[PDB]
Paper text:
DEP domain-containing mTOR interacting protein (DEPTOR), conserved in vertebrates, modulates the activity of the serine/threonine kinase mammalian target of rapamycin (mTOR), a master regulator of cell growth. mTOR acts in two functionally distinct multiprotein complexes, mTOR complex 1 (mTORC1) and mTORC2, and DEPTOR is the only protein reported to bind and inhibit both mTOR complexes. DEPTOR is a 46 kDa protein comprising an N-terminal DEP (Dishevelled, Egl-10, and Pleckstrin) domain tandem, herein referred to as DEPt, and a C-terminal PDZ (postsynaptic density 95, disks large, zonula occludens-1) domain. Biochemical analysis and cryo-EM reconstructions of DEPTOR bound to human mTOR complex 1 (mTORC1) and mTORC2 reveal that both structured regions of DEPTOR, the PDZ domain and the DEP domain tandem (DEPt), are involved in mTOR interaction. The PDZ domain binds tightly with mildly activating effect, but then acts as an anchor for DEPt association that allosterically suppresses mTOR activation.
DEPTOR-mTORC1 overall refinement (map 4), focused refinement on symmetry-expanded protomer (map 5) and focused refinement on one protomer classified for the DEPt region (map 6) were used for modeling and illustration. In the mTORC1 and mTORC2 complexes associated with DEPTOR, the mTOR active site adopts a non-activated conformation and is not occupied by substrates. Binding sites for short linear TOS and RAIP motifs in mTORC1 substrates remain empty in the mTORC1-DEPTOR complex. Consistent density for DEPTOR is observed in two regions of the FAT domain of mTOR for both mTORC1 and mTORC2, in agreement with a regulatory effect of DEPTOR on both complexes. DEPTOR binds to mTORC1 and mTORC2 in virtually identical manner via its extended PDZ-linker and DEP domain tandem (DEPt) regions associating with the FAT domain of mTOR. Indeed, we observe weak residual density in the DEPTOR-mTORC1 complex at a binding site for helical peptide segments of substrates and the inhibitor PRAS40 on the FRB domain, which might represent a dynamically interacting segment of DEPTOR or copurified interacting proteins. Indeed, such an alternative, substrate-like weak interaction is indicated by residual density observed here in a known substrate recruitment site for mTORC1.
Author numbering:
A (entry chain E): 374 to 469
B (entry chain J): 304 to 409
C (entry chain E): 277 to 325
D (entry chain B): 17 to 30, 37 to 53, 60 to 74, 82 to 156, 162 to 223, 233 to 246, 258 to 289, 304 to 317, ...
E (entry chain B): 1408 to 1758
F (entry chain A): 1056 to 1143
The structure:
């Protein structure tokens, strides 16, 4: 219940349904959330200093979810390859 | 007629470089101010000092108008354009180490 | 539940009636409702792992 | 606040006493008045050092006041006539602190001390000298008020056979002659040369040096710097956080000095000390016979002891002043330095070797004994400034200096402290050292070692792609973060956190490092908490996935402390914290700006000064971040702020009030229209220019008149009998009419209460002298006079009724219109009181 | 009646904000004393810059050149804005001049260099201005923003405000009217603050321009004050990037009886000189500018040519409207009709 | 207060912010002999449970100052420490 990721869920909800007055009444085009983009940005920052066998990146299952769409598929496939490059320990994680 | 030239000496190249004779070198360290140092260098090859603010810190520590410089904040600028020297002094620290040729009334 | 917490002060003009009339579906990830469902699936699968 | 205040008073009376006076000054920073006067009097009469510590400290911080000045002036006037040494100089420092307070009584107090100082010119004579010396530095204007008595009395009193006077009175003459030059000199040179023609040696030489030294600052500016021994292109933050005769007689000045240096060679230590100070400054004015007389005394004083310190200082100035001719005496000077160093005082020897270069290749061989002396702050300051001026072998300098540091750090406490200060002060060319320094701070129980080893490692990681270096930086920075979170001593925790600058933000944005930083946002010390939220806010661009969720949770808590905590300090701390968030994480806060602003406006309409000051500084930072989304609230905040600007009753400072108003007008773009809505705006802002004394505040009051634009004078016009009496009447009528008019003005308002008796005695005398022509004035006088009787109290009532009786006797039949009111008055104020009964019956 | 009395009478009237009375004093001087008794300084006080220049020219022709008459004539040139002639007099006379007049020269020489856009000359002149003056701080802060020395710029502005303390306080004591001059100095200072933001925040640009436009309209319609303000904003905004400012400016020059300056302004906005190519048709790009030029030409008594241009222009407008009317450009079409309507009205009244 | 907390349970967090100002004043100036009114208020905070989530940052500093103050008596310090134990 007290995991940090829960705080991210609140912000994601907040930004998503702050637009609802404008979507319903004004008819504004629903801009997509930066969530998945920003989560890939966090994974990229991890890769920069990821050589050591430290705690694995929290966002690994998010990278999986990003592969399902096309909007961020190119960026994820790049980062996922760079991660697998780090070593065979990482490829084991991605398979698990 | 747009540019202004206040330097009587037409050229000083190859005359400075020769040791001794007309001038004796001196190094002036000028501290920055709230509104600026107050000196201008407008010499093409020798980078002679164009003007000095009489009320500025530079005029208090010597720095007469009829002078030539060859090095700023350590870096030797004996042969560069005046505009390039203006870039170096602004991009450098607040306090500037300057070498003045300081011709001895000749 | 989000609309019952104290954090609603941060979004004035968000009542339950707006939540009832949220546009989209739970399948179409390009809609607002499908966006949240997709995000939620990622966040929950991340906490678990 | 009384018993324990007197308990610690006798404690400080009987290092520990200075800290008890600093804590008393720190307690006076927050802070009854009678008990402080009694506590000061308790410490005064008893010991004398603690009494001066009590007086001076309170006056400076609590502020000089008419009550405090009148009382403590008698205490200071009692100490001066007779006191011990050391205590006298402390009492003279309490004069200087009082004289720089900036009060109206300062003009009287300073001129009281100066006039009595001239009367004296031994605890009397040296006291007057310290008073005049400190006042000459602190107060140039009133020191110049008595210059002709100054020179005449002092040239008599200086040459008396005393040492303490000669030390201070020349420093007073120094402070005086500097003020005379920038704005006497013949009378100075006459009395100085009269004195020269062994007590009458070292004083004349100092007076002659004053004319030499002031005429040429080049000599003094070298001595002044040796005694002590950002960028213009930077982009400002996008959100602004809240904030002649001395040259003509100079020839004879050195002429009588060249002979004095030979005359007073070893006559009556003190004279030799002043000679070796003066000789270089005289030579720097005019350098061979003058040099030969100098060199004989200087070179002989270097071999001797108790002067070697000042001898090299003169020798270093002589080497710079006399360039070529000094080169003959190089073998003499260098042999003495080569003999002086092996014994290890020599901190000055190195300073003068730096001034000797201020060069030859011989210095390369001179380095191997120099470094063998040892680590001193003078040595490393010299070698640093040596590579500045002559960078011929800067690599060889760093080679030997790093070899010295390596020999040291391969191997008590205070030396390791200074060795780390050296290692982190100036640049160097370091992996093992830093991984070994990671061991020292963890395994040191010394607070000062940990605090310095932290400052050192943070400085030595300025070189921050190689995997090994990254893994090393990651290891060290993880250990540093652990120390910054876990160390008990909060000073060490604050230093470490402050040292984690922009440079490290690439590493701090790692998950593990960010989990540590979050813990740090709940530190016991509010100041550390402030610094942590700034760092995390700055990282909200690097790793938004972590930082943005966490700052939202923190924002909720901040707004909870604001709204629901009913406590000044907690609310003040919460506002301050929201300040740092707005500035460092503006993207996060932009969607939530309307909630925050409503919460803050509600705080502004609540019925502690620092809370409103921090709330205003936050609203001002929101203005810039809002980016035109706060327009709907601008007219609300404008009313609030204009309500707070007018009057000085409001606790909140006008400065920050005016600053936040500036930021609103600027960002939101409310120009010209506010002038129409609030017409007093131009009258309020031109009133600060006539009232405010602070520059910063006056500066803002202009910057806000700037942003609001320059209103057209017509647009501002749209936005907003005594001579006549004489013009008509003859003078014999005019005089009653003007007298009455002048009395009627006093009759209204509370001014009448002070002058109740005199006003009505006049009006009665006027009516009696006029006769029946006073009837004219009846409609003016009566309604006021009756309302005065209504609101008057006590004794005046009876007197007014007495004088009303006189009035009625003069007016006679004409009083009929006002008679009904008079009866009502009588009916209301008739009491069984015997006094008023006799009065009313007469009326 | 004495000349000294008349001079003092003029200065008293200006302090009392009664310009018309002081002008009447000069008319009295003209009649009863002629012209020799009228010094050029009298025109300078009355802001008769055209007649003051004629006076200083007549005086400098007969009398030998003097520091006082040179500065007087140069002061007139800067008020008119003839930056070409003012910079010519500077470059000619530098070594010929003493250091006392030098400090009274550079404040005007820098203004001229800034106007012409020659930044090397401007740097030389600003150093000669004394730092203790308000202007000395202001002009140093301007050369800061040209070189992007933002940190030093803010420093110099603060000292400039500090030096305006003495001026603002003195003028405020005796009515708002006298304080207006100081008020304009702070206006230009706070505008220089909003040029630093303009050079740092691309997102804030259109907001700053709207603020600038609304601020200038609250300011008084004096041409001198506008020239100062527009020269400042021109540090980061070319005249083409904001037409309506420079068109309203030209209109003031027209109403104030300075059509020469109005003409130069309009030529600079048009892009070319119609005055030179009389046979060619007027350029259609920027039509609101062209229209302003024609109604200026009419005031210049070239009213047969103006009328002919208007006939050509409206034929061009109505053809440019018809062919370019799509659904997209509806706001442009609405502004083009509002223009064409005013064109047709001018056609009529002119006919 | 203790009886309202057990009665409402989860719904108490709506009303707790009104009571917080008085509870924070109790800690600042408690003149109770041996601060037994403070000890009682600690025992109440234990019942508050997961209600304190949104307000723990407010309550905790007073509690922390309570068990770290040496002037304060040992019973009241044990009561504060045992409270933090439970709330954990
Ligand atoms: O001087 P005019 O020939 O009579 O022209 C005026 C004048 O325009 P200019 O800016 O070119 O001088 C008005 O401006 P003001 O100087 O009075 O401020 C302007 O009015 P606005 O400022 O409201 O636009 C008005 O325009 P309009 O007819 O749309 O009201 C316009 O008239 P013409 O264009 O018809 O000559």
């Amino acid at each position: 219940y007290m995991h940090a990721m829960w705080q991210a869920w609140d912000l994601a909800v907040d930004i998503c349904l702050s637009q609802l007055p404008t979507i319903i009444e004004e008819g504004t085009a629903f801009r997509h959330s930066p969530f998945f983009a920003e989560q890939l940005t966090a994974f990229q920052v991890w890769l920069t200093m990821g050589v050591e066998n430290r705690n694995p990146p929290e966002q690994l299952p998010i990278v999986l979810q990003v592969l399902l769409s096309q909007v961020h598929r190119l960026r994820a496939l790049d980062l996922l390859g760079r991660f697998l490059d780090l070593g065979p320990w990482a490829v084991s994680l991605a398979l698990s | 007629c747009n540019p202004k030239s206040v330097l009587k000496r037409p050229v000083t190249s190859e005359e400075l470089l020769t040791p001794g004779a007309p001038y004796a070198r001196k190094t002036f360290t000028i501290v920055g101010d709230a509104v600026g140092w107050g000196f201008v260098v407008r010499g093409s090859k020798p980078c002679h000092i164009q003007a000095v603010d009489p009320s500025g810190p530079a005029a208090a520590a010597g720095m007469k108008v009829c002078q030539f410089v060859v090095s700023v904040n350590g870096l030797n600028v004996l042969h560069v354009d005046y505009r390039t020297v203006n870039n170096l002094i602004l991009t450098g620290p607040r306090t500037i180490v300057m070498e003045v040729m300081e011709e001895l009334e000749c | 539940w989000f609309c019952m917490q104290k954090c609603v002060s941060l979004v004035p003009g968000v009542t339950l009636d707006l939540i009832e009339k949220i546009p989209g579906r739970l399948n179409d990830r390009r809609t607002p409702l499908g966006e949240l469902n997709w995000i939620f699936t990622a966040i929950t699968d991340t906490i678990a792992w | 606040x009384x018993x324990x205040x007197x308990x610690x008073x006798x404690x400080x009376x009987x290092x520990x006493x200075x800290x008890x006076x600093x804590x008393x000054x720190x307690x006076x920073x927050x802070x009854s008045t009678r008990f402080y006067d009694q506590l000061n009097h308790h410490i005064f009469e008893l010991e004398r050092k603690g009494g001066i510590l009590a007086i001076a400290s309170l006056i400076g911080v609590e502020g000089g006041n008419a009550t405090r000045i009148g009382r403590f002036a008698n205490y200071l006037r009692n100490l001066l006539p007779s006191n011990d040494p050391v205590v006298m100089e402390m009492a003279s420092k309490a004069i200087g602190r009082l004289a720089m307070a900036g009060d109206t009584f300062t003009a009287e107090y300073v001129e009281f001390e100066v006039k009595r100082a001239l009367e004296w010119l031994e605890g009397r004579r040296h006291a007057a000298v310290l008073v005049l010396r400190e006042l000459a530095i602190s107060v140039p204007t009133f020191f110049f008020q008595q210059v002709q008595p100054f020179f005449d009395n002092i040239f008599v009193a200086v040459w008396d056979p005393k040492q303490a006077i000669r030390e201070g009175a020349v420093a007073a003459l120094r402070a005086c002659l500097i003020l005379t030059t920038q704005r006497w000199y013949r009378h100075t040179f006459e009395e100085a040369e009269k004195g020269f023609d062994d007590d009458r040696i070292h004083g004349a030489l100092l007076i002659l040096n004053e004319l030499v030294r002031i005429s040429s600052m080049e000599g003094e500016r070298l001595r002044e710097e040796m005694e002590e021994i950002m960028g213009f292109g930077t982009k400002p933050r996008h959100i602004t956080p809240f904030t002649x005769x001395x040259x003509x007689x100079x020839x004879x000045x050195x002429x009588x000095x060249x002979x004095x240096x030979x005359x007073x060679x070893x006559x009556x230590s003190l004279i030799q000390m002043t000679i070796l100070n003066l000789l270089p400054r005289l030579a720097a004015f005019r350098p061979t016979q003058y040099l030969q007389d100098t060199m004989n005394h200087v070179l002989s004083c270097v071999k001797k002891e108790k002067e070697r310190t000042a001898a090299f200082q003169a020798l270093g100035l002589l080497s710079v002043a006399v360039r070529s001719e000094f080169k003959v005496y190089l073998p003499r000077v260098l042999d003495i330095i080569r003999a002086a160093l092996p014994p290890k005082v020599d901190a000055t020897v190195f300073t003068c070797i730096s001034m000797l270069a201020r060069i030859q290749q011989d210095i390369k061989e001179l380095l191997e004994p120099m470094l063998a002396v040892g680590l001193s702050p003078a040595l490393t300051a010299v070698l640093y400034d040596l590579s500045r001026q002559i960078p011929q072998l800067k690599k060889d300098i760093q080679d030997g200096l790093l070899k010295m540091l390596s020999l040291v750090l391969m191997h008590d406490v205070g030396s390791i402290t200074l060795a780390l200060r050296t290692l982190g002060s100036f640049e160097f060319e370091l992996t093992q050292f830093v991984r070994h320094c990671a061991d020292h701070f963890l395994n040191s129980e010394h607070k000062e070692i940990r605090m310095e080893a932290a400052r050192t490692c943070s400085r030595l990681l300025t070189p921050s792609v190689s995997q090994t270096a990254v893994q090393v930086v990651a290891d060290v920075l993880s250990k540093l973060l652990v120390v910054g979170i876990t160390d008990p001593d909060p000073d060490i925790r604050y230093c470490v956190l402050a040292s984690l600058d922009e440079r490290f933000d690439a590493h701090l944005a790692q998950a593990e490092n960010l989990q540590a930083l979050f813990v740090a946002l709940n530190d016991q010390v509010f100041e550390i908490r402030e610094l942590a939220i700034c760092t995390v806010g700055r990282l909200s661009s690097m790793n938004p996935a972590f930082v943005m969720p966490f700052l939202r949770k923190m924002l909720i808590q901040i707004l909870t402390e604001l709204e629901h905590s009913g406590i000044g300090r907690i609310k003040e701390q919460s506002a301050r914290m929201l300040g740092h968030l707005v500035s460092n994480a503006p993207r996060l806060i932009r969607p939530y700006m309307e909630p925050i602003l409503k919460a803050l406006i509600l705080k502004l309409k609540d019925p502690n000064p620092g809370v409103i000051n921090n709330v205003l500084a936050t609203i001002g930072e929101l203005a810039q971040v809002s980016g035109l989304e706060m327009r709907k609230w601008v007219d609300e905040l404008f009313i609030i702020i204009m309500d707070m600007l007018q009057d000085s009753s409001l606790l909140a400072k006008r400065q920050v009030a005016l600053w936040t108003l500036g930021q609103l007008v600027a960002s939101t773009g409310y120009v010209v229209e506010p002038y129409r809505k609030y017409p007093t705006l131009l009258e309020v802002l031109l009133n600060f220019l006539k009232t405010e004394q602070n520059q910063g505040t006056r500066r803002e009051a202009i910057r806000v008149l700037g942003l609001l634009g320059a209103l057209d004078p017509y647009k501002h016009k749209v936005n907003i009998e005594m001579l006549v009496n004489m013009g008509n009447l003859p003078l014999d009528e005019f005089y009653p009419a003007v007298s009455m008019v002048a009395l009627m003005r006093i009759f209204r308002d509370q001014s009448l209460s002070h002058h109740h008796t005199m006003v009505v005695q006049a009006i009665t005398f006027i009516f009696k002298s006029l006769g029946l022509k006073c009837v004219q004035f009846l409609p003016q006088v009566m309604p006021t006079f009756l309302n005065v009787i209504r609101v008057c109290d006590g004794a005046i009532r009876e007197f007014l009724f007495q004088q009303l009786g006189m009035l009625v006797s003069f007016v006679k039949s004409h009083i009929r219109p006002y008679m009904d009111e008079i009866v009502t008055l009588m009916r209301e104020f008739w009491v069984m009181n015997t006094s008023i009964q006799s009065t009313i019956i007469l009326l | 009646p004495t000349p000294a009395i008349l001079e003092s009478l003029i200065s008293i009237n200006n302090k009392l904000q009664q310009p018309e009375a002081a002008a009447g004093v000069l008319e009295y001087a003209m009649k009863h004393f002629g012209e020799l008794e009228i010094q050029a300084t009298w025109y300078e006080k009355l802001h008769e810059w055209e007649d003051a220049l004629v006076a200083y020219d007549k005086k400098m022709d007969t009398n030998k050149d003097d520091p006082e008459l040179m500065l007087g004539r140069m002061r007139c040139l800067e008020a008119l804005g003839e930056w070409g002639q003012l910079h010519q007099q500077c470059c000619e006379k530098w070594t010929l001049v003493n250091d006392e007049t030098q400090a009274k020269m550079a404040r005007m020489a820098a203004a001229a260099a800034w106007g012409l856009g020659q930044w090397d000359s401007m740097e030389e002149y600003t150093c000669m201005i004394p730092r203790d003056t308000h202007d000395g701080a202001f002009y140093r802060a301007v050369l800061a923003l040209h070189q992007d020395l933002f940190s030093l710029a803010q420093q110099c502005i603060d000292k400039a405000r500090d030096l305006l303390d003495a001026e603002l306080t003195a003028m405020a004591g005796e009515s708002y009217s006298r304080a207006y001059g100081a008020m304009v100095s702070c206006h230009m200072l706070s505008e220089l603050e909003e040029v630093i933001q303009y050079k740092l925040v691309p997102e804030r640009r259109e907001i700053i321009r709207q603020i600038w436009w609304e601020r200038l309209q609250g300011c008084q319609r004096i041409v001198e004050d506008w020239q100062k303000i527009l020269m400042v904003r021109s540090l980061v905004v070319s005249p083409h990037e904001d037409m309506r400012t420079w068109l309203k400016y030209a209109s003031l020059c027209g109403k104030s009886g300075r059509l020469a300056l109005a003409h130069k302004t309009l030529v600079l906005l048009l892009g070319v000189d119609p005055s030179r190519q009389l046979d060619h048709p007027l350029p259609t790009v920027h039509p609101q500018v062209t229209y302003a030029y024609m109604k200026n030409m009419w005031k210049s008594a070239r009213k047969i040519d103006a009328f002919q241009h208007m006939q050509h222009f409206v034929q061009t407008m109505q053809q440019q409207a018809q062919h370019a009317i799509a659904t997209e450009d509806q706001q442009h079409k609405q502004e083009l009709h509002k223009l064409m309507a005013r064109c047709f009205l001018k056609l009529g009244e002119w006919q | 207060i203790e009886q309202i907390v057990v009665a409402l349970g989860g719904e108490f967090k709506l009303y707790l912010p009104q009571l917080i100002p008085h509870m924070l004043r109790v800690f600042m100036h408690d003149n109770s002999p041996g601060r037994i009114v403070s000890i009682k208020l600690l025992a109440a905070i234990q019942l508050f449970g997961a209600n304190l989530d949104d307000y723990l940052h407010l309550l905790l500093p007073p509690i922390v100052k309570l068990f770290d103050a040496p002037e304060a008596p040992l019973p009241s310090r044990k009561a504060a420490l045992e409270t933090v134990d439970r709330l954990t």
